Amino acid sequence: PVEIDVSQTIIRDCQVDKQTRELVYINKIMNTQLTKPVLMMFNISGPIRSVTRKNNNLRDRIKSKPDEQFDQLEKDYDSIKYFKDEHYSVSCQNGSVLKSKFAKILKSHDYTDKKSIEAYEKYCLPKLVDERNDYYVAVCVLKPGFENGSNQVLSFEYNPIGNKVIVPFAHEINDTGLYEYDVVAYVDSVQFDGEQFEEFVQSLILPSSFKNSEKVLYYNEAKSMIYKALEFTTKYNWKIFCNGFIYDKKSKVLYVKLHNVTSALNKNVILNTI
């Protein structure tokens, strides 16, 4: 009977200067009220200048960007910049730094739990810390009052180091070695990487219509298009659940749709800027 609406994860990361980029991160975590202070962490390809706070509106305006570029595919029938404000606190440090003081930092963020700092320290920090470099980590802790208002979408003004862009897909580590994804992202000003998209897409497990005779197919339709899709026949050749990555070679844009698909990979998409 009951019709359901998802509460997923929307990402738009745009190049604004020849030096600066803006990241809008709207995440399910931010749509709850006051389970006490909450915490998020991701990687950014560079230092954060400002953490603005747009309209609980910018949400669905960004989302449509690829739902639209995918809906056509278907066929249905070394320091710690601190940024505090009224209800949230944010930090921008290096992974090696966050590792090193990981605990004190969250305590400075008025996090200060116990099992949790142990939990996050254990399950998430390992996944947003690498060898190659010292990618920055965004340590965000939304506090209570956050729930009030219609300006609960966040913006991170930042300037990429080297010429890379990171799209914060990676989840925390779980025992069952499987990750369930629900994300849409708009990312412009990055060079195509058919290699890594290909790897990420082939690792996906779409959902099912329970229509026994359905076959999941894989596509690389060079704009380049690398996705998977659930197909079957009702005369009527359905082609739903297209999930994956579309890449405009004109606009030089990237639409990413990983909506309710399960993968064993747990990584961010890392790109180069033009």
Extract the runs of DSSP E, i.e. beta strands, from 118-214. 136-142, 154-158, 164-167, 179-188, 204-205
* Phi, psi (deg, nearest 5) at residue 126: -60, -35
Residues near 70 by beta carbon (within 8 Å), at least 6 away in sequence: 227, 242, 243, 246, 255, 257
Query: Are the C-beta atoms of 71 and 51 separated by less than 8 Å?
Result: no
Look at the block and give the residue holding tokens 């006051």.
34
Distance CA 154, CA 51 (A): 7
Distance CA 226, CA 198 (A): 6
Q: Length of the chain in residues, anyone?
A: 274
Residues near 49 by beta carbon (within 8 Å), at least 6 away in sequence: 20, 157, 158, 159
What's the Rg (C-alpha) of the chain?
19
* Phi, psi (deg, nearest 5) at residue 117: -50, -25
Distances (CA, A) of 171 to 111, 114, 148, 223, 267: 20, 21, 27, 29, 8
| Token code pair at residue 78 | 């070394």
Give me the residues paired with residue 229 across strands.
217
Look at the block and give the residue holding tokens 């229509």.
211
Query: Are the C-beta atoms of 162 and 270 separated by less than 8 Å?
Result: no
Distance CA 76, CA 59 (A): 25
For the chain, the distance separating the N- and C-terminal CA atoms, rounded to the nearest angstrom, is: 49
Query: Are the C-beta atoms of 266 and 173 separated by less than 8 Å?
Result: yes
Distance CA 79, CA 101 (A): 12
CATH architecture label of 1-274? Sandwich (2.60)
Distances (CA, A) of 88 to 40, 52, 265: 11, 11, 31
Distance CA 267, CA 140 (A): 19
Sequence ranges of the domains in the chain: 1-274
Distances (CA, A) of 27 to 31, 64, 130, 185, 239: 8, 16, 24, 12, 28
Distance CA 96, CA 35 (A): 30
Distances (CA, A) of 124 to 91, 101, 129, 173: 16, 15, 9, 6
Q: How was this structure determined?
A: X-ray
Distance CA 165, CA 156 (A): 13
Distance CA 179, CA 193 (A): 22
Distance CA 273, CA 14 (A): 10
Helix, strand, coil shares of the chain as percentages rounded to 5?
20, 40, 40
Residues near 107 by beta carbon (within 8 Å), at least 6 away in sequence: 117
Q: Residue 5 CB: number of other CB atoms within 10 A?
A: 5
For this experimental structure, what is the resolution in angstroms? 3.1
Distance CA 98, CA 119 (A): 15
Q: 91-122 as b/e, with b when 16 or more CB fall inside 10 Å?
A: bbbbbebbbeebeebbebbebeeeeebeebee
Give me the residues paired with residue 15 across strands.
21
